[PDB]
């Protein structure tokens, strides 16, 4: 996969690698799940998320 189309399937950041290799990454306050694309909050107040709505 390539980071320029569909974000390489990544939820957040994407790095191309020599080969058909691609690495997704997550912003500080998040961790990458085993699917290798999704990012999940590791802290109470991660960037870019709105707590009143995340609560609902």
């Amino acid at each position: 996969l390539i980071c320029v189309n569909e974000n390489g399937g990544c939820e957040q950041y994407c790095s191309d690698h020599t080969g058909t290799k691609r690495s997704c990454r997550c912003h500080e306050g998040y961790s990458l799940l085993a699917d290798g694309v999704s990012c999940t909050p590791t802290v109470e107040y991660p960037c870019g998320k709105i707590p009143i709505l995340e609560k609902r």
Binding site: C14, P51, I52
Partner: protein, 250 residues
């Protein structure tokens, strides 16, 4: 903000209000607990650099509800390429004297990676712009934080549809040409915020335009993707004496 709506309290939690001797100066965007992004032109006429305040968790300026957090601005960092009184390179990075405490009402916006911003975020059509600026051209400013959804234009289409300064590669147009909807004087320095897969990112800074909501014209925003590395490097740097710092760009 012209032709938008009140941002419900807590839903624009990265919005900053900048004050100079208690008076409204400009907006900004919190990107972590000590750093705020704003517009370089906000500081063109600062006389006493020591009386700059950033307020987080602000919503209704007529009252105090206890969610607000104010901090002295310890540093204003402006790229070397910015010329006061002009429009290009309209970005400032502010260091707060003390971190804000993250809460339901105070949360940073994510500063994206450059590649992700260029390759993915730049093609998200709509993005939110916010501030306590003028609600009308030649009008009074907002007491309640306002927000507006605006669509982004490729620069060629902006120029084609605009009926000025150049739109440089350090800028982009967003909004409407019919005079209904715009960011305005007072909103300068505030966030242009882009949603992707459940998370919001900083893509723009409220910068300039012809009057507010002027027919045949679009709002113009600093293209933040050009500044990611410049910002990240400054965030790893030690503070320097004196508030204003001009730093080499690139």
């Amino acid at each position: 903000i012209v032709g938008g709506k009140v941002c419900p309290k807590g839903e624009c939690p990265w919005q900053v209000l900048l004050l100079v001797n208690g008076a409204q100066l400009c907006g900004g965007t919190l990107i972590n607990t000590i750093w705020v992004v704003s517009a370089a032109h906000c500081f063109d006429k600062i006389k006493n650099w020591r009386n700059l305040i950033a307020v987080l968790g602000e919503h209704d300026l007529s009252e105090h509800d206890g969610d607000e957090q104010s901090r002295r601005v310890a540093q204003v960092i402006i790229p070397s390429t910015y010329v006061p009184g002009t429009t290009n390179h309209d970005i400032a990075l502010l260091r707060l004297h003390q971190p804000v405490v993250l809460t339901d009402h105070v949360v940073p916006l994510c500063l994206p990676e450059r590649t992700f911003s260029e390759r993915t975020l730049a093609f998200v059509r709509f993005s939110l712009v916010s501030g306590w600026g003028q609600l009308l051209d030649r009008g009074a400013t907002a007491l309640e934080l306002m927000v507006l959804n605006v669509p982004r234009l490729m620069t060629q289409d902006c120029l084609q549809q605009s009926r000025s300064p150049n739109i440089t590669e350090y800028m982009f147009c967003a909004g409407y040409s019919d005079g209904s909807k715009d960011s305005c004087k007072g909103d300068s320095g505030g966030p242009h915020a882009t949603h992707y897969r459940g998370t919001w990112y900083l893509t723009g800074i409220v910068s300039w335009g012809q009057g507010c909501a002027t027919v045949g014209h679009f709002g113009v925003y600093t293209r933040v993707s050009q500044y990611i590395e410049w910002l990240q490097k400054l965030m790893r740097s030690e503070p320097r004496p004196g508030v204003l710092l001009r730093a080499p760009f690139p």
